């Protein structure tokens, strides 16, 4: 029945790092009484775990212990403060200590770090660990007083070997009742026992379990090269994310931009490389962000001569928008690492940047509030969650292989599909991030972060950030955007973007398909029935029309007109037209895909009970000119129904007429640029073409389901 | 509802159905949805007979036989698991789940046709745990069992530190496990059980297309934890054979399972409503099979005779001289003389009456072997266990030894190696054979007529030792040179099989361990009785010492003795 108030927590930490804050949060979760030593004092040691060290905490605790040299009734425990996260309540800890009944319990470890020779001197242990680790201990104040009063060495002396030598004395160990926790009852060192720990969820809290010994530890000390694994473990224990209650320390600690002052200055950046499709859309989208232009400093670094005309066209609009606008053209012959590094240094040497916000070329931000929410988060580093459409490829990583390469974690499939929501600790981010300026200034002062080795610049950047001890958070609470596909982007066309129908269908539809199509499909009117069994619904936007006529005029070869044919297997056209079939241009497969995806459902909803697979063999674009060819004679079409789409605006470019249904006395006189005509053409509908008078007109015709 | 899918299970069905019949659950509250398909044997007929006989005892029986085809065209053999077979089995399991749902039946137990559910209370015990999915832990001759404690990411076995502590029942308890298979209960009364399916894989299912993995994913997506319970010893199952294995290998594996049952339990009695196939014992091509047994021992005698009839091994019972019942005048009339200076190396005794009786029993067997001119004879002690395929593997080895010729005298088949060091030299061109070193546990060996003649010509009666001290002397492998110095003819060509086929039934210190050889009085006097000193019994089992660096890699192994699936 030990009272909880007799236990005092003692930790040492020179500075205040994010790890120390995490430990403080974990300790405060179970109302622990923590006293910190060496707060602000210089680290008179050296490398934390490279070869040796730890000779200053002993001196500090020897100076501290003089106040409690006689407090027998008090129980004191010491522990690291940078890679330790508490998990259990004090009551169970003191209960376990009472059950052990020793005077000083040390955390046991698997290997002998400082020396190897003294291994045989250790008393034998059945199943658990045998050696001693200096990661912490629990003991009476008099006992620790006696054991550590004997310290008289240099401040740079190693620590664990002194404890090992003191423990190895048999008589003193018997007198001091020194014991080791071999079966992981209190302390669990993640080094060497990575496979003996599993996460045991609960309702409103989380814990860890040692499967090998079937016990629940209280303190975990992820020492050694296990920073990644303990950092992963810190996402849940003890209040990270439980199924009942969402996220924990994920909603508080927000700036909320109060005061009405001009919002903190932002140094935007753009790195257009590996030529990115749909560039003009992103350049246009660069303006409509929800942040005042006077507080936005742009830096557009190009690396492609191919994309030079687009940036040149867009440049004046940006120049009028932002307070400061700069360009670095492709002629500088600058590798991406240099670009990122001098952008980083340009902000780093300008005290007026407070959040250096990179944004790569292939990251479309469909949410216009990304900057506001991310800045409100006030994380040291933070990235938004973007994933390819209908895949698993995201912009972060779960865990790193021993080769420092992409492995697969366990929760990654959860996080990519938003089954879990919060702000997650992550060992690699890219393609969009928000870094705090102070971290740039007094935390990353060296210049060479992206260059300096053979590794990729991004991996080098995250590796540099990992060793310095800086967290790389990541949030996916809302929806932020999607990553484009630049695996293959041919550029041997006037508008090579038109071939991107397979690669990025959603943005292709957004740019190209007429904006009124979806509303018409879901059934709020729009579609018209000028004559029975005839329908008028808009399909294409103006960009499709103008880029298509541009491509076809680039080809230029206007074959057709003769009553015979070689493109036809039969070799005898019922009626000839001057036409360019999609087969010779190489665009036919994309057109069949478009018919399959964006026309089929329209016809199925328009004609109930009809089922289609959208097969088309003959598809072409016909030009009507008053001098080349007149309109067609009355005839019939060799297909179930015919899709008829105009390609240029009537009046502004040409004057004429549309279709003429003989059996119904129907005349179509005003074709629209972005609309399509659907009508059966086998039996019921005898149609004739009206003659063009002035100008030149283009019409797209296809025969589906022959 | 008790379900059962059976294919080519005719060797196993008689004992398994009797075990199901012995379950203490009211048959008017049970059912049956037994289906059988793609049978190459008479399984459908045996099952039809049983179901016809038991039909009036159960609430209902739904029978869906398909006698043809006997195989799929995409199958390479009876043990090949093709995708078409996996798909069909998944469809069958889905249909069984549907049948279970339509009668609103309380729970479904999918018993596999090769699972021996020997504990009659298995159902009541599993029901009392009140779990949505719970499997009885089934025991097997290996680390194999009906559950996995771990999976990496593709659904393959992943060794975990929990498996061995669970497998040995050092930790008893219902344990969360990522997979249970073969035998498991689903509670259909629990609401969450409605979303489980085996036929349509989950839309998000992206793992290997395998019937046990797909169901585990469905369980995972439904948030249904599959618990495994090992609180009791529920029963036994055979180990999955290799793909190129025959139906005979499967039948022999199941027979070995029944033999292992018979090691610690009364025999699993077959159903009285099912016939039993006639066995035709043979002597496996040996000239004689001897069985040494103490007249006072009958439990072991009966067990061994049943085990031999099980393996179709003909044997001649050989009686034995009870040296403990022997008086001095009988020993003297036989001319039995102890080797001068003989002292048991572990305790400090001259000998026991039991060791004398054993020695004289072997001497009498060797004499009969010589008098009859028996070219090859097998000698058994009564507390042996069989390796898998024992008879066929031993007959193949002996046929290879004879065909390739060998002047062998005492090829050891089962022993305790006492010299634990560098490997022994493999005999060239003879597979699975090594030169024998110093050995304890002379439980059984084959001897040739030449060896028996040499042993009789050694005149061993004037220099009596225990058989396990005499034999290493006779092959010049005895470590004590003084004992060899007591003898002159040391020309036994002794070899040993590497994969021993026989082990003790009980080791020293095992529960039920009794030694009629060690617990005997001293040859002389009657007040010097030696009790078994639990502290002094030493050679309990020469196997834990063996997990050392004895190599043994270089012996030509036989294709036999191959088993396990991805759970070992």
């Amino acid at each position: 029945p030990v009272n909880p108030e007799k236990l005092l927590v003692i930790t040492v930490a020179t500075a205040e790092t994010e790890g120390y804050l995490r430990f403080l949060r974990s300790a405060e979760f179970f109302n622990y009484t923590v006293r910190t030593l060496g707060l602000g004092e210089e680290w008179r040691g050296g490398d934390v775990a490279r070869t040796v060290g730890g000779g200053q905490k002993v001196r500090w605790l020897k100076k501290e212990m003089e106040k409690y040299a006689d407090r027998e009734d008090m129980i004191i425990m010491f522990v690291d403060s940078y890679d330790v996260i508490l998990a259990g309540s004090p009551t169970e800890l003191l209960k376990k200590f009472v059950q052990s009944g020793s005077r000083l319990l040390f955390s046991a470890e698997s290997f002998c770090w400082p020396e190897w020779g003294l291994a045989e001197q250790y008393p034998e242990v059945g199943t658990g660990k045998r050696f001693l680790n200096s990661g912490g201990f629990i003991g009476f104040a008099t006992t620790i007083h006696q054991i550590v009063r004997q310290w008289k060495y240099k401040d740079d002396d190693d620590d664990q070997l002194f404890y090992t030598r003191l423990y190895l004395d048999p008589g003193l160990r018997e007198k001091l009742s020194l014991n080791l926790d071999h079966k992981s009852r209190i302390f669990q060192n993640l080094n060497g026992a990575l496979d003996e720990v599993v996460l045991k969820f609960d309702r409103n809290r989380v814990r860890i379990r040692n499967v090998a010994y079937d016990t629940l530890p209280i303190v975990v000390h992820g020492n050694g090269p296990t920073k990644l694994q303990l950092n992963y473990l810190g996402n849940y224990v003890p209040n990270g994310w439980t199924p009942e209650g969402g996220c924990g320390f994920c909603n508080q600690d927000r700036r909320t931009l109060p005061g009405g002052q001009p919002p903190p200055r932002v140094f935007l950046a753009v790195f257009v490389e590996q030529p990115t499709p749909f560039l003009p859309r992103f350049l246009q989208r660069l303006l409509l962000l929800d942040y005042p232009p006077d507080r936005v400093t742009l830096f557009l670094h190009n690396n492609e001569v191919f994309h030079e005309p687009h940036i040149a066209d867009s440049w004046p609009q940006l120049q009028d928008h932002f307070s400061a606008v700069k360009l670095v053209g492709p002629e500088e012959a600058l590798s991406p690492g240099e670009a990122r590094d001098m952008a980083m240094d340009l902000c780093r040497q300008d005290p007026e940047c407070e959040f250096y916000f990179s944004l790569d070329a292939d990251a479309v931000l469909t949410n216009l509030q990304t900057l506001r929410i991310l800045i409100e988060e006030n994380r040291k580093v933070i990235a938004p969650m973007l994933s390819r459409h209908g895949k698993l490829w995201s912009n972060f990583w779960g865990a790193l292989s021993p080769d420092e390469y992409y492995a697969r974690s366990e929760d990654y499939v959860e996080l990519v599909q938003r089954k879990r929501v919060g702000v997650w600790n992550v060992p690699y981010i890219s393609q969009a991030y928000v870094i705090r300026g102070d971290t740039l200034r007094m935390e990353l002062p060296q210049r060479d972060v992206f260059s300096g080795s053979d590794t990729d610049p991004d991996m080098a950047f995250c590796k540099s950030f990992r060793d310095k001890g800086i967290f790389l958070h990541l949030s996916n609470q809302h929806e932020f955007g999607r990553l484009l596909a630049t695996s293959r982007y041919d550029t041997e066309h006037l508008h090579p973007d038109l071939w991107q129908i397979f690669d990025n269908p959603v943005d292709w539809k957004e740019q190209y398909i007429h904006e009124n199509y979806s509303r018409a499909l879901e059934g709020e009117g729009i579609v018209e029935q000028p004559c029975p069994d005839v329908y008028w619904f808009p399909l294409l936007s103006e960009q499709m029309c103008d880029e298509l006529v541009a491509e076809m005029e680039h080809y230029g070869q206007w074959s057709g007109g003769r009553h015979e044919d070689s493109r036809l297997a039969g070799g005898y056209e019922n009626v000839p037209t001057v036409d360019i079939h999609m087969k010779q241009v190489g665009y036919e497969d994309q057109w069949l895909q478009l018919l399959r995806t964006y026309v089929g459902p329209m016809t199925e909803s328009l004609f109930p009970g009809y089922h289609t697979k959208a097969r088309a063999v003959m598809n072409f674009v016909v030009r009507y000119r008053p001098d080349e060819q007149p309109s067609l004679r009355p005839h019939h079409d060799s297909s179930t129904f015919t899709l008829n789409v105009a390609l240029n605006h009537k009046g502004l470019d040409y004057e004429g007429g549309g279709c003429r249904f003989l059996r119904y006395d129907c005349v179509i006189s005003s074709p629209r640029k972005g609309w399509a005509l659907l009508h059966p053409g086998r039996l019921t509908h005898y149609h004739e073409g009206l003659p063009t008078t002035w100008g030149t007109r283009y019409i797209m015709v296809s025969f589906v389901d022959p | 509802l008790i379900a059962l899918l059976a294919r080519n299970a005719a060797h196993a069905l008689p004992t398994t159905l009797g075990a199901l019949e012995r379950l203490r659950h009211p048959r008017e509250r049970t059912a049956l949805w037994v289906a059988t398909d793609h049978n190459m044997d008479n399984t459908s007929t045996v099952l039809r007979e049983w179901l016809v006989a038991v039909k009036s005892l159960y609430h209902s029986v739904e029978w869906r036989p398909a006698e043809e085809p006997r195989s799929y065209p995409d199958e390479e053999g009876p043990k090949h698991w093709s995708d078409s077979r996996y798909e069909h089995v998944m469809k069958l399991r889905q249909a069984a789940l549907k049948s279970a749902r339509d009668m609103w039946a309380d729970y479904i137990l999918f018993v596999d046709a090769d699972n021996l559910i020997l504990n009659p209370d298995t159902l009541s015990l599993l029901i009392a745990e009140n779990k949505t999915v719970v499997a009885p832990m089934l025991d097997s001759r290996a680390a194999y069992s009906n559950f996995w404690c771990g999976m990496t990411s593709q659904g393959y076995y992943k060794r975990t530190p929990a498996y061995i502590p669970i497998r040995k029942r050092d930790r008893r308890g219902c344990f969360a496990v990522p997979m249970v298979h073969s035998t498991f209960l689903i509670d259909l009364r629990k609401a969450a059980s409605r979303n489980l399916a085996f036929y349509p894989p989950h839309p998000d299912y992206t793992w290997s297309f395998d019937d046990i993995i797909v169901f585990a994913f469905s369980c995972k997506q439904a948030e249904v934890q599959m618990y495994v319970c090992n609180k009791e010893e529920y029963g036994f199952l055979p180990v999955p054979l290799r793909a190129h294995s025959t139906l005979q290998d499967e039948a022999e594996s199941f027979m070995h399972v029944q033999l292992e049952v018979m090691v610690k339990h009364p025999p699993a009695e077959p159903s009285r409503f099912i016939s039993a196939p006639t066995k035709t014992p043979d002597k496996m091509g040996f000239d004689e099979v001897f069985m040494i047994n103490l007249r006072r021992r009958q439990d072991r005698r009966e067990r061994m005779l049943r085990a031999l009839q099980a393996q179709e091994i003909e044997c001649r019972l050989v009686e034995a001289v009870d040296g403990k019942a022997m008086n001095t005048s009988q020993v003297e009339a036989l001319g039995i003389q102890m080797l001068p200076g003989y002292r048991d190396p572990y305790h400090g005794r001259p000998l026991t009456k039991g060791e004398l009786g054993c020695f004289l029993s072997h001497y009498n067997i060797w004499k009969e072997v010589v008098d009859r001119g028996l070219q090859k004879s097998l000698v058994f002690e009564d507390d042996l266990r069989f390796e898998i395929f024992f008879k066929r593997r031993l007959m193949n080895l002996m046929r290879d030894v004879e065909r390739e010729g060998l002047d062998w005298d005492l090829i050891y088949v089962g022993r305790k190696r006492m010299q634990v060091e560098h490997p022994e030299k493999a005999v060239p061109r003879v597979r699975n054979l090594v030169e024998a070193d110093y050995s304890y546990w002379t439980l059984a060996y084959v001897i040739s007529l030449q060896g028996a003649r040499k042993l009789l010509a050694a005149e061993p009666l004037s220099k009596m030792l225990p058989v396990d001290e005499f034999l290493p002397v006779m092959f010049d492998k005895h470590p004590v040179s003084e004992y060899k110095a007591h003898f002159s003819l040391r020309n036994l060509h002794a070899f040993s099989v590497e994969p021993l086929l026989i082990y003790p039934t009980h080791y020293t210190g095992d529960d039920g361990y009794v030694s009629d050889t060690e617990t005997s009085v001293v040859w002389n006097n009657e007040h010097v009785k030696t009790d078994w000193d639990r502290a002094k019994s030493q050679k309990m089992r020469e196997q834990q010492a063996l997990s050392r660096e004895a190599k043994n890699s270089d012996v030509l192994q036989s294709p036999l003795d191959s088993a396990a699936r991805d759970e070992l």
Partner: peptide, 19 residues
Amino acid sequence: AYFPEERWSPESPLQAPRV
């Protein structure tokens, strides 16, 4: 793949009786 998860869920309530 480090630290395999143990996501438990409370059992579902019993289904309503038939009629």
